[PDB]
């Protein structure tokens, strides 16, 4: 025909005229160019075409015009049905050596044409996103070493950013699925070092630490996938006891990482950048997270006590921008509260600016808690969300911000809203404000809140007195005791 | 000035955990259920918050089935209707402890929530099932003007110095990165 099916190229490939069959390929792929869907009435024809194409693959490919076969195996690889006709041993190894990322089946390599590297990396990530036995084999065929070598070794090279983008995406797709791949990338490769060098070369940290707030659009993309894989390495291998040779590169990662929260992306990507950057800041070690409250100081933002805290104001602005979404909160405002908690839990003079931003001296207006539209009324309403993790991080964020005391916590929030936190770990009759925290009696409020029985001891402001228009006829609740057992 | 820990619960089913976990302000240990008379329970309090009975989220299929009469969570709703809508608790507040989340999450990948009632219509995840249970327990009370009620889905985890149990948020953000990435 003119826009023919895979059935026509099935009986056209058996008449293997090379220019005619590449004409059939080059006319097929431009028709089905970026369509993510297909038809279902030609399915076994597509399966037989896949078998024929991997016969061509595992027998070896042409010297020239190989990019046509690579384009067609990419554009057929996007099908959901033809996974089991691709996920074989010699097919994956052929795609690896045409991707120049294999450990064996390699000479001292020819200077590679980047087009086949784009198509082969696209084929690899498409093949690992589906077909889980291809993930198990790509773990088993040891592909990660040349990927790590390549991403570490364009400190001094000039690649197109699409190549590094798809290479990092393949590294991420490997590390997000096989625990052996991430345990190989973390310990016995120490890839955190080289991936942070790639993070530097994406960022470009220098003097004039971001007055030019624009970060380029493609560079935000590859830095975003860098942050993806860097979170994907060290999420389970966090060590609460470390050494200076271990923690020194961690602290270096932090010192370059503080630059990321400040700047803005292009388009609307500036949310997603911080939305993964704070996730990377989540699992860093606690004893060397103190670069947030220890950066350089200058006349930009007003400081609190010897040190600028503008990154913490940026974190609070990110929290206010990230709170009123209410769809998927456990993945968006859990690590932010964890970062601000473990920032405030270790050194005092950041919690004072945190306290001045989240706990103003309460005027105690005729509104309750959790009924207004501010920070306190949002998050203490969030304290009784149906997800265990969001409550577990928000109640700890307000238990640290009250400097860990049974008063000055229900005075601000409410026993009715924080009794679950207190029941979790709070009632011990031990009295732990941890000694070093600022024991100031001056928490007497602005409008001078009234007596201990005027306000609700479980809720907020003065509302009324109970009428109670009753007499006699007591002892009603007698049903729970025989059914508790 | 811890004013009212009016505690109660289904005793050896979830409430053993709460009586083990309840050990300027101090607090007393008092009145777990005892069998005092009206001369001692004239005022149980002045109308202050009763920390409500445990609901273990596991008796919902573990029926106290002497005749397969009724699952114990519906009996819990019945005694909740007795407790909450009494006129002697007019201006109060009520703290729900939806307890023992773990086996509820384990059983939502099992025999579905037909055991509560066939009025249920959620898609058998944990979120919408717990939302339906919270919705039934809150709208079992109707007036909500002088009595506001607060619900807590606790986990009853070992809260000690180990964060391997904190893996769930990391699994969520990894799987969300996996869903958010796609073919191209």
Swiss-Prot record, chain A:
Q: Where mainly found?
A: cytoplasm
Q: Which Pfam families match?
A: Ric8 (PF10165)
Any one cellular component term from GO for this entry?
A: plasma membrane
Its annotated compartments are: Cytoplasm, Cell cortex; Cytoplasm
Q: Which InterPro entries match?
A: ARM-like, ARM-type_fold, Chaperone_Ric-8_A/B, Gua_nucleotide_exch_fac_Ric8
| SUPFAM superfamilies linked | ARM repeat
- Where does the secretion signal sit in this chain? none
Indicate the impact reported for residue 438 to A: Decreased ability to fold G-alpha proteins
Swiss-Prot/TrEMBL keywords: Chaperone, Cytoplasm, Guanine-nucleotide releasing factor, Phosphoprotein
What does the annotation give as the result of altering residue 415 to A? Does not affect ability to promote guanine exchange of G-alpha proteins
Q: Could you describe the post-translational modifications of this protein? A: Phosphorylated at Ser-438 and Thr-443 by CK2, stabilizing its interface with G alpha proteins.
**Gene3D superfamilies given in the database record:** Leucine-rich Repeat Variant (1.25.10.10)
Q: What is the effect of changing residue 228 to A?
A: Does not affect ability to fold GNAQ
- Residues with Phosphothreonine modification: 443, 445
Q: Name one GO molecular function term.
A: guanyl-nucleotide exchange factor activity
One GO-annotated biological process of the protein: vasculature development
Q: Provide the effect of residue 166 to A.
A: Does not affect ability to fold GNAQ
Q: Which domain of life is it from?
A: Eukaryota
PANTHER family membership:
SYNEMBRYN (PTHR12425), SYNEMBRYN-A (PTHR12425:SF4)
Q: Which family does it belong to?
A: Belongs to the synembryn family.
This chain's protein is named Chaperone Ric-8A
Curated annotation (Swiss-Prot), chain B:
Quick one: where's region G4 motif?
A: 95-102
Please tell me whether the keyword Signal is annotated for this protein: no
Q: Where is this region: G3 motif?
A: 27-35
Among InterPro entries, the record links this protein to: Gprotein_alpha_I (IPR001408), Gprotein_alpha_su (IPR001019), GproteinA_insert (IPR011025), P-loop_NTPase (IPR027417)
Q: Where in the cell is it found?
A: Nucleus; Cytoplasm; Cell membrane; Cytoplasm, Cytoskeleton, Microtubule organizing center, Centrosome
GO MF terms held by the record: adenylate cyclase inhibitor activity; adenylate cyclase regulator activity; D2 dopamine receptor binding; G protein activity; G protein-coupled receptor binding; G protein-coupled serotonin receptor binding; G-protein beta/gamma-subunit complex binding; GDP binding
Show the segment(s) annotated as G5 motif: 154-159
**Which domain of life, per UniProt?**
Eukaryota
- Kindly indicate whether the keyword DNA damage belongs to this entry: no
Q: How does it sit in the membrane?
A: Peripheral membrane protein; Lipid-anchor
Q: Which GO terms describe its cellular component?
A: cell cortex; centriolar satellite; centrosome; ciliary basal body; cytoplasm; cytosol; extracellular exosome; Golgi apparatus
Annotated positions of the ADP-ribosylcysteine modification: 181
State its Enzyme Commission number(s).
3.6.5.-
> Which top EC class is given?
hydrolase
Summarizing the annotation, the consequence of altering residue 162 to E is: In NEDHISB; uncertain significance
Reaction it catalyzes: GTP + H2O = GDP + phosphate + H(+)
Residue numbers spanned by region G1 motif: 4-17
GO terms in the biological process aspect are: adenylate cyclase-inhibiting G protein-coupled receptor signaling pathway; adenylate cyclase-inhibiting serotonin receptor signaling pathway; adenylate cyclase-modulating G protein-coupled receptor signaling pathway; cell division; cellular response to forskolin; G protein-coupled receptor signaling pathway; negative regulation of insulin secretion; positive regulation of cholesterol biosynthetic process
Taken from the record, one Pfam family name reads G-alpha
Give the residue range of the signal peptide. none
Q: What does this protein do?
A: Guanine nucleotide-binding proteins (G proteins) function as transducers downstream of G protein-coupled receptors (GPCRs) in numerous signaling cascades. The alpha chain contains the guanine nucleotide binding site and alternates between an active, GTP-bound state and an inactive, GDP-bound state. Signaling by an activated GPCR promotes GDP release and GTP binding. The alpha subunit has a low GTPase activity that converts bound GTP to GDP, thereby terminating the signal. Both GDP release and GTP hydrolysis are modulated by numerous regulatory proteins.
Q: Which disease is it linked to?
A: Neurodevelopmental disorder with hypotonia, impaired speech, and behavioral abnormalities: An autosomal dominant disorder characterized by global developmental delay, impaired intellectual development, delayed or absent speech, hypotonia, behavioral abnormalities, and epilepsy that ranges from self-limiting to intractable. More variable features include non-specific dysmorphic facial features, distal skeletal anomalies, and brain imaging abnormalities.
Q: Which family does it belong to?
A: Belongs to the G-alpha family. G(i/o/t/z) subfamily.
Q: What is this protein called?
A: Guanine nucleotide-binding protein G(i) subunit alpha-1
Q: What is the originating organism of this protein? A: Homo sapiens
